Amino acid sequence: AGIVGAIAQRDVAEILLEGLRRLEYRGYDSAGLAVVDAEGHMTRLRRLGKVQMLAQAAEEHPLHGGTGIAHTRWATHGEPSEVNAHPHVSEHIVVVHNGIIENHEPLREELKARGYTFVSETDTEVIAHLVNWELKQGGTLREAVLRAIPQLRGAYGTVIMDSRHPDTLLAARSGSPLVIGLGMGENFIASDQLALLPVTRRFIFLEEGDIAEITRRSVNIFDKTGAEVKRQDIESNLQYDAGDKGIYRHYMQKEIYEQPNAIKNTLTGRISHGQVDLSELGPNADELLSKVEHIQILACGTSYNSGMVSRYWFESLAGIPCDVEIASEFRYRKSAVRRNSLMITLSQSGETADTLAGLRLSKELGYLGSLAICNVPGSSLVRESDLALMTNAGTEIGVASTKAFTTQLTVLLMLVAKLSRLKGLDASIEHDIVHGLQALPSRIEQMLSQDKRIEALAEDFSDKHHALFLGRGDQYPIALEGALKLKEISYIHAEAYAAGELKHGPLALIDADMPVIVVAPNNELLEKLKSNIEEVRARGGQLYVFADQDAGFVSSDNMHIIEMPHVEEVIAPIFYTVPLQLLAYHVALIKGTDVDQPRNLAKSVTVE
Amino acid sequence: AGIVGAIAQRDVAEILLEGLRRLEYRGYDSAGLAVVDAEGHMTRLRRLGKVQMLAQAAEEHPLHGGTGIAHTRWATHGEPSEVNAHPHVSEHIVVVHNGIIENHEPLREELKARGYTFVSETDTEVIAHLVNWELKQGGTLREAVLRAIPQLRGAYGTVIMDSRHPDTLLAARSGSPLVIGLGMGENFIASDQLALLPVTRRFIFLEEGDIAEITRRSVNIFDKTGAEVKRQDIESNLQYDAGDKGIYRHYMQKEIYEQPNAIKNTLTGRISHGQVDLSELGPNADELLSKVEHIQILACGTSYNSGMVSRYWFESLAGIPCDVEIASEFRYRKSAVRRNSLMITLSQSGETADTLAGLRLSKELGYLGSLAICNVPGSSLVRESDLALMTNAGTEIGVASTKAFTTQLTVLLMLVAKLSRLKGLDASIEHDIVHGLQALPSRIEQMLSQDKRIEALAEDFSDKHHALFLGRGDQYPIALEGALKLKEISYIHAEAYAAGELKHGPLALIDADMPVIVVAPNNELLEKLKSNIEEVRARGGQLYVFADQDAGFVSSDNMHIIEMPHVEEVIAPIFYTVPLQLLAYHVALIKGTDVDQPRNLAKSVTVE
Amino acid sequence: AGIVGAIAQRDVAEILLEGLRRLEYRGYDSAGLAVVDAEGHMTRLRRLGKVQMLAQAAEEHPLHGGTGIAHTRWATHGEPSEVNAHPHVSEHIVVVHNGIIENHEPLREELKARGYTFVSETDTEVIAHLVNWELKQGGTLREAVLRAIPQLRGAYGTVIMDSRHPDTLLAARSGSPLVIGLGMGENFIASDQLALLPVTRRFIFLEEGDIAEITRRSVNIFDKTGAEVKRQDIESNLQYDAGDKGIYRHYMQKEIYEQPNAIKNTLTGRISHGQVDLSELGPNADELLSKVEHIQILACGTSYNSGMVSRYWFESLAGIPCDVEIASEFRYRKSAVRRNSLMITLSQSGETADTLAGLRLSKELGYLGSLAICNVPGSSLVRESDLALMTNAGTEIGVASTKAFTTQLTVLLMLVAKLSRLKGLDASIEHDIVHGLQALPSRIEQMLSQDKRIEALAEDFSDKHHALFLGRGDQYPIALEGALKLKEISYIHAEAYAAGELKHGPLALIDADMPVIVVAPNNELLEKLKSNIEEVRARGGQLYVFADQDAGFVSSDNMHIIEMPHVEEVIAPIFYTVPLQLLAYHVALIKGTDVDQPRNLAKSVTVE
Ligand SMILES: O=C[C@H](O)[C@@H](O)[C@H](O)[C@H](O)COP(=O)(O)O
Ligand SMILES: O=C[C@H](O)[C@@H](O)[C@H](O)[C@H](O)COP(=O)(O)O
Ligand SMILES: O=C[C@H](O)[C@@H](O)[C@H](O)[C@H](O)COP(=O)(O)O
Ligand SMILES: O=P(O)(O)OC[C@H]1O[C@H](O)[C@H](O)[C@@H](O)[C@@H]1O
Ligand SMILES: O=P(O)(O)OC[C@H]1O[C@H](O)[C@H](O)[C@@H](O)[C@@H]1O
Ligand SMILES: O=P(O)(O)OC[C@H]1O[C@H](O)[C@H](O)[C@@H](O)[C@@H]1O
Ligand SMILES: N[C@@H](CCC(=O)O)C(=O)O
Ligand SMILES: N[C@@H](CCC(=O)O)C(=O)O
Ligand SMILES: N[C@@H](CCC(=O)O)C(=O)O
């Protein structure tokens, strides 16, 4: 379940154990480690149970040495026991293993008929004995492993050492992940980079098939053949940019105006022959998804707002039950899991602590599985989910989310077709969805071209300290987002409310210092809201209405129609986000606030 | 439940009984009284059941004496029984008591060790034995009482007499009301002046912490230190001919303060044999309920807030899926009904147009059936639902709802047991809920007893135009309701947020004109939030924390701990509603806003 | 200039050298390191020139040992030479130091008299002997250090080890940054976190006045009184590889903190043998400059402010007439040129239209010639002038100028020696100037170390809409620039005035909404201003005073002294600029305004 390896000048056992602690979120039923001093004395220590047991034993009888491998196990072959736990040995050959060697018994009898005593049930032990064999005939660890790897079928990863030669480790990625961590005169490796953070941030991710020879001072990478490939050491990931601001003053402004392009990119590879094509999920996929009867979405901030929009879509268009929840609230409560529930997480950054906690928790609760909708490749939410859909918006530098939100919405709309319930309705539905998606980039462009009007409109808000945003249905979460945006970058106390709840409280607040915005109401809703604002005429209440030019609404003295171009219904919520983004942007511009880095806010909330 | 005491020249039994009769609106399961003659002969009579039984018993066997005390009991510790009814005795010490001694176990032990025999199951008996013990070492009843008080935890509201010295009563106002009634050559005391109207109209209201020593011809009041305190004696005009708000300035005030009795009425006939009893729903329905797999709740405003708490309850305590939605949102969208779904509506008035439309719409979407939780008999939601549970709160006249909310909560919590889907126990869950509910009224009185404190706190808010209310889990909808209340009757732009989401937007708004309130956080949460408010120290950000005194939280200069009495966790959400109602009320008083009829709001919104 | 320290199981020499490598971007002229093995054998290497030389020298040595310290030097006291490099020793005491011990002569004489031999010209060496002396009396290294710190006056970030006991390091911060890196069973320290990145991301920043005792496994921090103080370790969730802001939140912030190094770059190659070396100007430079009888300076904005400082310098220290004028005023009027007049333009960008026009016009007016002080090579102003001096501050991205201003001041101060006319009567003028210039970089760092206090002070201006900045003589243009900065990035209406003119008008304006700031006044001036603010106590007039702590100024209730460390008089105006820059920056942070791109301002005004 977890692998860790170190080759250093200092004692590495403490580091190995700490690595395993940090791998506890996965696995596991047993654990163990094996280290080696300079004289070649290998000390091995294994327990059935928690890592804490192993650390306990390790404490009162310390392991000394600068070379070592450690492992946490989730048994697949052989009952959980100290006997079957890793590392496994073949005399001087020591091995840790993740995944499965599929052809175990063939090779095990092959080697058994060669003098090898299999003391365990695991498929792993075969690895050890085989490496032993191949080393029997000259060469050293590398050549040998290079021969042995092809003789193992299966998705797996393994780290291998010879205690007669502590200066080298060998690794093999063949269906299960491994990453190397670069230290100073020492080097590490693990099944996930989470394990190496205490000790390094320089990583070399192995490619599928790669084989690595690691020393204190060197790291050589090859493939199945043995031909020295080179791999680069990433760290991040979220670089900026300059520069890439182009004709725009601010990262956030740029990110607003690139939304058509970002959406095009989100659509790329996912539309064909007038249908939604999510085949990128896998050959299976279309079959895990078929079993889903309920959707649970978890997110924070703006991502929560996108989830909130998607609920309306899933329930009305696809006919699937869908719940959306603040991740903080999910992780801290005992919940009731619905039958056949898909867990979806929404996250720009993929690192938000609350949302990650929610996903991990979901794993113990009996969810069908998880899908991450995310904007940053190789992030934690992505690595830890069963399925992932990247938004492809490009890096987003402004602290307030803009393109990340509209691309999230795009992907969520794409899921609707691929998850319908509710068949027969039906092709009319996926049809309308795809037509809308095809229209979307241009509709956004239309909307961006209203910027001068929105920029003029912002003068009505730049001296305000309160605002109320109203919305109904698939537009309520758009009002939420518009309010959040005004909070974020202009510091105005803007609050969103469901349109039908105005009379139940907020109406008592409305006056000249608290403008009311409604997002895309139909005529019936508007009549109701006009009547409401008439109730507070004597205090100078103003209604602002972003609405379809086709609707024919007529401005009055206390109600200002801000007409917009027509849109396909199915994408209207995405469309109507843009003006609210532009409004917040232009208010901030007038006030002179720090748009890209608003006070007290962070791009990503990753620590607790 | 009800206390009456008397000290006169004439016989007082008839007066004490008439007092009890006049206190009957406070739910009770039993009653008793004790009187002493000039010679020191003490007579006590106690009966299970109605005051009528007690009076009748007293008639065959007339009680002589000018000194006496009297009590109706609402059982919290020890079943209703003659054995457990008050007054309780420790030889010459005779005591009546309202409320809950938090440390009765340890005290009962220490007193048993000193040789006292406990004949009842009540916490109350420890008071009598403890006073008897402190009196052992000589002194005045007063000094003994003063010694006893510090060793007591919780609400020890009490009236005490020593049958050897019938010339004095001792009273301690702790946890519920006590009013002194001044006669001519006689004095009286009761938990409400209604009890005393037959004999006087001059009253002195006792405050939390006051201790009174009373004789026929004098009244001396002091705190636990001994220091005299002055309290003014007001004369009562009126009788109760006013459209009675009685002693209260506003209907909303009355309705906040009658919450204990309202709740008692909500429980009538619904607890039997230590279990929840909803047999009123009929045998036919207890069957339907076994079939429910999912709960759906529709409501508007404050009713929506109570539904929102219940979500957390049903999911964690009953392990059933529960969803809660604004009625207008549900009616105007096409939804996906869950398998075997119960439709629940919450509504004070039963006529709210959105909620009613929601019920009607649901009639054709395939729910198992509908249940209405309501406060108005005969109303639309009650007639059109399959089942109905009335809150029995009495009429609510204030436009903002208070007792309707807490009675709604009381019903919802009772529904938990009868809709349980967990296994094992489940049994202890229903026991905890039942004990919680039996304690709830006393708990509310303890909160009401904090009103002066809350009234001082209101000064920090009276001139604000913004506020942010935070809560996590089952306290988050309590923050919703707190904020709504401040909006409603004080016109302050108060907004509620999930505690976990503060860093995701609202933190950017916080400064001196926008105080932050947290409802009932644990230490981990308080730490996160404390760090947050540190982030906006430079802008004069203030954090106000309502929390359990037992938590041992400590104030700093920008974080203010408003400690509260300890309460059972299952009813903490109800309990913590009260200080938020009191806050809004007192802010409104300072500003002089129209509490009972806030601008632009209506009792119910019955028109489309 | 740079400090690194390590205490580990493994050898730390390579780690030390790599740290220094990562500190190299900071101006240095030499480097050294010293490491101690477990047997207490101490190996020390020092070399003149780049870190590369040090690393080579290390190539020959088996530098074993787990404890050590290392340093890059920027000489202030004693020529750059291997003899003068750090670490400096006193037998078993080994010491690295950033900053300036200015009571170094008293201490060196006292220690010489006590039997110590000073083998170097540095101020640093007295620390090594002093600690040595203090350990001679006994106690632990920590106690000796506590006794020694108080005897030091000035700036010191120092790390200190005893080769006889290599398991402990001591560090003290006062006027120069230190930060601790926490590892796995090893610990580290550095003057700059960038040096610790290869081995850890967990830091504890030492604050002003702190003293730390570091072992492999412990960190204990405390103040000069031995009183343990606590600091929070925090994971560094920073992306160091993200873009050009490096570790900073804002370009302007980075440009403020970069000021010491920018200044070192301005000084590079312009001090030779204790004298200003402007030979870069050409062989026949002194030829033109000798003829100059009068200086005319033209500039806009902040550049005009530096010019304005220089006027005082030129006239008082070089005794040449100097005139400074807003460029647009000069270009549009018919002026009367002085005889043998040198035309100097100051400009960060070299492209400002008014300034450029000024120069061009001067071409036809009979000036001896033109000198351009500029920060961008190849700019119009540089190309079109006879002589040019570049400030070498590196690119400046912030719209408001910071390092451009202080580097300009540095160049202008160097011109003073090369343009002298006091005969004299001189010699010591140039010596003083060169001394101040040598100290400048660490003096600026000393100011930066006061940032926490300036941050705190900012709360006092965060909500103000007016301010008045006062200065006299060479501090008056500093007030000009402080006031400009506050206008620029916080949008507060701040205005500077000559101190002596306060009573001639602005005094009428003063009240609580308009704080008064004085920069670096002497006692006589201070008393005048104190009386002035008295006149307006009744309207809430506050006087904030930035002054030398050596002056012994005492705060009243409406006069607030903000003490600053002593500095060389001749560079006092550059010194006092920093706190006004930091003030404006922190006010903008609190208000959340666009620091890097303030509303309506441009980096340079190039169009007519
Ligand atoms: O008013 C506070 C309550 O005590 C509340 O905190 C609840 O009892 C626990 O938080 C349990 O939550 P879960 O059982 O859902 O985890
Ligand atoms: O943004 C506006 C949309 O057009 C929105 O109004 C939605 O498409 C309809 O409300 C349909 O939803 P239902 O099918 O659930 O009624
Ligand atoms: O009040 C305005 C004056 O007319 C003033 O503008 C001045 O007389 C001219 O501008 C000429 O000045 P110069 O001769 O210096 O260009
Ligand atoms: O979407 P995530 O990366 O999970 O972050 C959720 C939220 O985090 C922070 O608050 C950002 O400032 C927001 O803009 C974002 O919406
Ligand atoms: O509870 P209901 O009768 O369904 O009414 C819902 C809401 O309507 C109005 O706004 C009242 O002022 C509220 O106090 C109430 O909560
Ligand atoms: O120094 P210069 O390039 O000639 O520019 C003069 C002024 O121009 C602009 O106003 C910049 O914002 C200033 O910071 C600068 O001082
Ligand atoms: N199949 C191997 C490895 C399991 C794992 O990857 O944890 C075993 O059971 O030992
Ligand atoms: N707790 C006490 C008092 C009850 C009451 O306040 O009525 C009892 O159970 O007897
Ligand atoms: N003043 C000391 C230290 C200089 C520095 O901070 O680099 C010296 O001249 O060596």
Short mmCIF file of N, CA and C and ligand atoms in Angstrom, two decimals, chain C residues 300-303 346-350 352 355 399-401 488 602-604, ligand 6:
data_model
loop_
_atom_site.label_atom_id
_atom_site.label_comp_id
_atom_site.label_asym_id
_atom_site.label_seq_id
_atom_site.Cartn_x
_atom_site.Cartn_y
_atom_site.Cartn_z
N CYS C 300 11.07 64.68 -12.11
CA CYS C 300 9.65 64.61 -11.70
C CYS C 300 9.44 63.63 -10.55
N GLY C 301 8.37 63.84 -9.79
CA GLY C 301 8.00 62.92 -8.72
C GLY C 301 9.08 62.59 -7.70
N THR C 302 9.20 61.29 -7.44
CA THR C 302 10.12 60.77 -6.43
C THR C 302 11.56 61.16 -6.74
N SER C 303 11.91 61.16 -8.03
CA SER C 303 13.23 61.60 -8.47
C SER C 303 13.48 63.05 -8.09
N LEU C 346 17.59 63.40 -12.95
CA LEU C 346 17.37 62.16 -12.20
C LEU C 346 16.13 61.50 -12.77
N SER C 347 16.20 60.21 -13.04
CA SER C 347 15.04 59.51 -13.55
C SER C 347 15.26 58.01 -13.43
N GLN C 348 14.29 57.31 -12.87
CA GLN C 348 14.36 55.86 -12.84
C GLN C 348 14.32 55.29 -14.27
N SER C 349 13.32 55.71 -15.03
CA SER C 349 13.00 55.14 -16.33
C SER C 349 13.87 55.66 -17.48
N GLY C 350 14.47 56.84 -17.30
CA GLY C 350 15.18 57.52 -18.37
C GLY C 350 14.31 58.04 -19.51
N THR C 352 10.95 59.74 -18.96
CA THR C 352 9.90 60.69 -18.56
C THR C 352 9.89 61.95 -19.43
N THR C 355 11.06 65.51 -18.11
CA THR C 355 12.49 65.52 -17.79
C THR C 355 13.35 65.51 -19.06
N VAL C 399 4.83 50.45 -9.40
CA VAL C 399 4.60 51.77 -9.96
C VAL C 399 5.17 52.86 -9.08
N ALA C 400 5.08 52.67 -7.77
CA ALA C 400 5.73 53.58 -6.84
C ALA C 400 7.21 53.19 -6.73
N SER C 401 8.08 54.19 -6.75
CA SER C 401 9.51 53.94 -6.68
C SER C 401 10.05 53.82 -5.24
N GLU C 488 0.22 57.82 -2.89
CA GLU C 488 0.32 56.82 -3.96
C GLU C 488 -0.47 55.54 -3.72
N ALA C 602 0.97 55.68 -13.33
CA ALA C 602 1.71 54.91 -14.32
C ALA C 602 3.17 54.79 -13.88
N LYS C 603 3.85 53.75 -14.36
CA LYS C 603 5.26 53.58 -14.00
C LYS C 603 6.05 54.76 -14.49
N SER C 604 5.83 55.15 -15.75
CA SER C 604 6.46 56.35 -16.27
C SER C 604 5.57 57.10 -17.24
O1 LIG D 6 11.96 58.60 -12.29
P1 LIG D 6 11.14 58.80 -13.48
O2 LIG D 6 11.23 57.44 -14.42
O3 LIG D 6 11.65 60.10 -14.34
O4 LIG D 6 9.54 59.00 -13.09
C1 LIG D 6 9.04 60.05 -12.27
C2 LIG D 6 7.75 59.48 -11.59
O5 LIG D 6 6.93 58.92 -12.63
C3 LIG D 6 5.75 58.19 -12.20
O6 LIG D 6 4.83 59.07 -11.61
C4 LIG D 6 6.09 57.03 -11.22
O7 LIG D 6 4.91 56.47 -10.70
C5 LIG D 6 6.97 57.57 -10.07
O8 LIG D 6 7.24 56.57 -9.10
C6 LIG D 6 8.20 58.38 -10.58
O9 LIG D 6 8.91 58.99 -9.54
#
